[PDB]
From Swiss-Prot:
Function: Lysozymes have primarily a bacteriolytic function; those in tissues and body fluids are associated with the monocyte-macrophage system and enhance the activity of immunoagents. Has bacteriolytic activity against M.luteus.
Source organism of the structure: Gallus gallus (Chicken)
Reaction it catalyzes: Hydrolysis of (1->4)-beta-linkages between N-acetylmuramic acid and N-acetyl-D-glucosamine residues in a peptidoglycan and between N-acetyl-D-glucosamine residues in chitodextrins
UniProt protein name: Lysozyme C
Tissues/organs with expression: In the egg white and polymorphonuclear leukocytes.
Active site: 35, 52
C-type lysozyme domain mapped to chain residues: 1-129
Gene this protein is translated from: LYZ
Length: 129
């Protein structure tokens, strides 16, 4: 599924991400835009051989099992394929664990490089939330 901007904002808010660990909703939408272009089916291989899956590009090295990432963990206890669903529940639940891990949203390199320090409220402008 390719979400619309406000559609995704509403789904993330319903799942309790607005101000989760202090990160306003526009941070989460901005991250999703640059990670996946709001496409649940996005997959991208990393240099280390791991793969990032779904709307928030969650990595197989630590967070999900994809059966092909050596020496890796599965801290969200989920197959990576479940992160590609049109239902974002698994992605959101796993993201909540990631952002609690110590480094906040800096775990998402695209958030650090393209969202952090910007006017992220722009990402939810015009949405009925
Ligand atoms: Cl389709
Ligand atoms: Cl929308
Ligand atoms: Cl957009
Ligand atoms: Cl929802
Ligand atoms: Cl915001
Ligand atoms: Cl497997
Ligand atoms: Cl593996
Ligand atoms: Cl393969
Ligand atoms: Cl594990
Ligand atoms: Cl933080
Ligand atoms: Na990315
Ligand atoms: Na893994």
């Amino acid at each position: 599924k390719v979400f619309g901007r406000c559609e995704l904002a509403a789904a993330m808010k319903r799942h309790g991400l607005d101000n989760y660990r202090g990160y306003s909703l526009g941070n989460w939408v901005c991250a999703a835009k640059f990670e996946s272009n709001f496409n649940t089916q996005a997959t991208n291989r990393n240099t280390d051989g791991s793969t990032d899956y779904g709307i928030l590009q969650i990595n197989s090295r630590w967070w999900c099992n994809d059966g092909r990432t050596p020496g890796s963990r599965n801290l969200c206890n989920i197959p990576c394929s479940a992160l590609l669903s049109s239902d974002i529940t698994a992605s959101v639940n796993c993201a909540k664990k990631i952002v609690s891990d110590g480094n906040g949203m800096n775990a998402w390199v695209a958030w650090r490089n393209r969202c952090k320090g910007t006017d992220v409220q722009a990402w939810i402008r015009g949405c009925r939330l």
